[PDB]
């Protein structure tokens, strides 16, 4: 499951960068 976890963290991290997370 590590691949899936990393993939999900990466998309969530990119979503947060595009939408702004601060």
Binding region for its own copies (CB under 8 A): 1-19
In the bound complex, what is the minimum distance in angstroms from residue 8's beta carbon to its own copies? 4
Q: In whole angstroms, how far apart are CA 14 and each of 1, 8?
A: 20, 10
In the bound complex, what is the minimum distance in angstroms from residue 19's beta carbon to its own copies? 6
Give the Cα separation of 10 and 18 in Å (integer): 12
In the bound complex, what is the minimum distance in angstroms from residue 22's beta carbon to its own copies? 10
């Amino acid at each position: 499951m590590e691949f899936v976890a990393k993939l999900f963290k990466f998309f969530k991290d990119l979503a947060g960068k595009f939408l702004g997370n601060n």
